Ligand binder design. Sequence first.
Ligand SMILES: Nc1ncnc2c1ncn2[C@@H]1O[C@H](COP(=O)(O)OP(=O)(O)O)[C@@H](O)[C@H]1O
Ligand SMILES: Nc1ncnc2c1ncn2[C@@H]1O[C@H](COP(=O)(O)OP(=O)(O)O)[C@@H](O)[C@H]1O
Ligand code: BEF
Ligand code: BEF
Ligand SMILES: [Mg+2]
Ligand SMILES: [Mg+2]
Lengths: 49, 164, 50, 417, 417, 100
Amino acid sequence: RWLELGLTDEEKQNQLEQLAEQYDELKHEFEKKLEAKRRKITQGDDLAP
Amino acid sequence: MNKEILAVVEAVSNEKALPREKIFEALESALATATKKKYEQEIDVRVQIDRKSGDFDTFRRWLVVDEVTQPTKEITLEAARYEDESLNLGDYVEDQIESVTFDRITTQTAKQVIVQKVREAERAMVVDQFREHEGEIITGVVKKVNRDNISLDLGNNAEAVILR
Amino acid sequence: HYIGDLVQRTEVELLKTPNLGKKSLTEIKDVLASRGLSLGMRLENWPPAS
Amino acid sequence: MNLTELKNTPVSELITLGENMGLENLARMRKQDIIFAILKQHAKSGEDIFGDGVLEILQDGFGFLRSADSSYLAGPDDIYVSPSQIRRFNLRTGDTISGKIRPPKEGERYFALLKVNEVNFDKPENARNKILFENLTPLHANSRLRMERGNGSTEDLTARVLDLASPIGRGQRGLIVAPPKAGKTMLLQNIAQSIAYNHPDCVLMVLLIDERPEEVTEMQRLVKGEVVASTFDEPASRHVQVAEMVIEKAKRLVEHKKDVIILLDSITRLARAYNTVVPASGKVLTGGVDANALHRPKRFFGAARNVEEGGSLTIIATALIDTGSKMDEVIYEEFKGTGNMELHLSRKIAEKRVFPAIDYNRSGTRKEELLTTQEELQKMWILRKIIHPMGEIDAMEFLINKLAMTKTNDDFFEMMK
Amino acid sequence: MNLTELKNTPVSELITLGENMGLENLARMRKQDIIFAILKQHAKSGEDIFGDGVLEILQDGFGFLRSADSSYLAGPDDIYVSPSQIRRFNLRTGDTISGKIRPPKEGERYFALLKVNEVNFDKPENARNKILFENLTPLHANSRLRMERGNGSTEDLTARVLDLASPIGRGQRGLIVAPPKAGKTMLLQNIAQSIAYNHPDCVLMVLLIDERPEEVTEMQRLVKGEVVASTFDEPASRHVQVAEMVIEKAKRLVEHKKDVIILLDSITRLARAYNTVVPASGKVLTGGVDANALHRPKRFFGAARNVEEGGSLTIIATALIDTGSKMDEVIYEEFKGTGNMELHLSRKIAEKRVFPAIDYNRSGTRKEELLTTQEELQKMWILRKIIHPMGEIDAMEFLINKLAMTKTNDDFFEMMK
Amino acid sequence: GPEEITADIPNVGEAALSKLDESGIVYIGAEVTGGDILVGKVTPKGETQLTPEEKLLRAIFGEKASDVKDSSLRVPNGVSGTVIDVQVFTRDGVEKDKRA
Ligand SMILES: Nc1ncnc2c1ncn2[C@@H]1O[C@H](COP(=O)(O)OP(=O)(O)O)[C@@H](O)[C@H]1O
Ligand SMILES: Nc1ncnc2c1ncn2[C@@H]1O[C@H](COP(=O)(O)OP(=O)(O)O)[C@@H](O)[C@H]1O
Ligand code: BEF
Ligand code: BEF
Ligand SMILES: [Mg+2]
Ligand SMILES: [Mg+2]
């Protein structure tokens, strides 16, 4: 839970920011898929007039 | 859930005979009976619904005695070292929370306690308001006659009894 | 480890035992004494014969 | 670990302590939250705790231990006590309680006081045996509270003239009728320094209500006493709460036979807050002020008295007049004929660069003969006789010149002959 | 592509840029929508983006990056950030964040900040290590903020007399008690030009609330500073939102040890908005104003202080009096005894064509000796002594004549001898 | 008036209502042998615009809900079994019950 680290920035900062980008994108894609699934399973269904 | 209890406390018709305080304590007793029915043990507890602030909670009563039967309500006369009791008897705790108060059995026992206490409250109010008449002559219409006792309507939900 | 050794252990050692809160104490007082026995008793013949 | 010796430490010291205790960066949480986390960890290392705080009983019956630096507010650093302890040791509002405390549990949000070792600087056994403050028989002030410092500096005159205008004693009821732009804060600082130097035995209590924060931080580390204040960044609820609880603390201290003195600034803003906190009474007088809204402030003003058995409760409250406010006008009108000790300050002399701007003929003290011997009695009588025909500003400047000509009041009396 | 260097461009420039980028006729969509579409296409061409904006955390916990030109509003040009970044870099409201941003996705409606490279003009590593604004210890103003320009023009007098009436310093609390028809906008423009010329190091912040749009477009391109305003064409929600967020930005800047100065106009309309945005408290005083409705404005007014460690937060708020409004009457009554710096403007002199209409005896500054040496101290004391017996209009015109007779305050002091 | 799935079925024994939940649907894993109420379907027949106050009061004091017609569906006679699953579907806009 403490990904925040840095030393010898010239390459370490680049690799750590790339991994942070990947982590953010993965978490956001998972949250969006979760929200889509929830909205699909929670929306009402037409039954009859 | 607190919205439901607020609705049921505001929807009382005879708010005089049962104001908010005694209605909330009736609901406390009903939830205590519901919690008793929840666990197979027999432990008496209090609720303290927090009438005006928010939702309810539950506590756990000990009734400190030297017995051991039903240890949920058994604490020795000296178990006041840790957990901050500091007293000999009467020390209770908030240990149990998360009481379900909306299922079928809970609703049934709630309605039962509510009707029992509205009967008790109408009885108490009528006796407190027409007891000082002891020694005076008052009229009233009878409504049921039996071989052992008859009933009388005095008005404003007042019931008098006449024995043999 | 033995119930015959735990029955000779009143509550005074439970609330002082480390890592014992309110749920663990409730368990050790409910699922233990509901079998008919009591938490804290006075016996002498233990363990016969081991 | 005591709460005071940990909280009066600077914030940076708390940050370094928490960082040495192996914690997350403490620059995020507030001071109360920092103290809470520090105590949580310091108790996770064992360390049976020793805490203290002023007691407040809520509507439910339990008690909360508030701290002095937070001006008696609610925070995670508070200590909770069940009504069982209050029924056992016979506690009440305003009683400062100090004793052993333990870590909290899951579901609990505050610490628990196990056993009390001090109640208002007394044995917990004698805490249940104490005469009530209301059952006491008030009397007039007898012991003179001399305010003369003795160094004769440019500030000591501020108290010298005071002693030359209206004597003050233990349990006296004091009002300061001063318009704005007058330097009431300077008068309060001078009187606090005088009471801290001359009479360090009696506990000093200074209260600043509805005040700017600069004066709060100035008073909290300039005078020798427990300074509790309340700025205008909070609703009237906190104002009336701290007022009630400081007066309860003073009452408990007097019940413990202790001489307390409460400096209040200002009574007008406190009455304003008490008016806007109370629901309406049905009708309205001029200024938008309710009728019963002044019942609580008036009580607060009447709590001052000289106890015959022991102890005293002196009060000095500053009033705001000449502000063009209908509300303040009616508040001063109500509070005028209420106390026996009054000090009027002239705004015309105040903003004329003649300090301290005092009004001799308008100020005085009822039953002043009980607070001074015949010697100073006759001296002040001669002073009043010679100052009555004089004007306001000329008399004020002549008196301050003749006062600065010497060191103390005795040399002035001798030169007046 | 930065957001500021694209938005501060004229609208026609944005239209031609979008048309060169191969887009539909951009005269239909609004400025925010034009910026959104331009960024969408400029990112569709690759071009890893670099954005910036002031942070706002909602009730959910995520953050939105608002821009200064749109007066911190919600639009398609906003940048979204998840609470994960706020938990990592320890962000808070009012912190301006600048760094790399990416294109959005389907279902997403805002851009995402990938990594921050600047937080309040600081390293993102030190952004988590910063003392809170509330934990700071306020003090009085020490460094004098001189307002004298030095050219002696027909407008410089407006500041000269100011320096002759009430000294002003860093972290000072300022009120402008002026009826309408007085030219408060002219005073604000003069003080902004003075602070931009004399002290360009401290960031200038000017805020116009509930104002006509003409003054908004005048101030946004006349003074040298970041101008955020809010016209009356929006409900009180936007007013209180921009107030809270500009004060959060000022607090963050002070926490970063920066001297900020907030010019506000008017505090009366802002209090009106704060009153109509808050739900009722249960009861009502004269004027239809709620009790707790003034808690937030009062706090806003009390946020000004002189930090002992570093930085300062000066405020100058204009109040509306003499408008015949019960609400404004009670607002001014509440705000009168709140600050230590006040400037009263006389309407009778204002609409008498004698500018600037100032009131000498009514205006002043508490603890003014901490903002000036003994030299100007004695000079201002002599000035007050000579102006006190004089009237209002005659004294004002005599002072402005003797001021225009010279260039600066030193020549006036020398001719006064 | 529209139809409801409330559990307050009047003119019926409490033993029949004991199988239903707080909403009006039988629990998951309840045994039924004969015709028993497993859904609390009610249909109003008389006066409309039932006020919520008197609505909840009928469940406590006073009279019962007359406009019901006792249209609660039951299992046919002879067929038995244990209910294992429930599937509820609501119209767009209508508020769902707690079982949904
Ligand atoms: N005894 C005194 N000697 C010298 N100067 C004084 C004295 N009392 C007040 N002053 C001056 O008068 C000013 C009063 O300021 P302040 O305390 O804010 O007024 P108030 O508290 O009455 O509103 C101070 O700046 C101080 O320089
Ligand atoms: N100090 C000044 N010098 C010259 N003209 C002034 C000055 N103050 C005000 N005015 C004139 O008075 C008018 C006031 O306009 P405005 O700023 O809208 O009023 P206010 O801000 O006082 O409500 C301006 O048009 C300006 O020309
Ligand atoms: F101290 Be000032 F008179 F508000
Ligand atoms: F600026 Be004006 F007083 F509306
Ligand atoms: Mg003062
Ligand atoms: Mg203007």
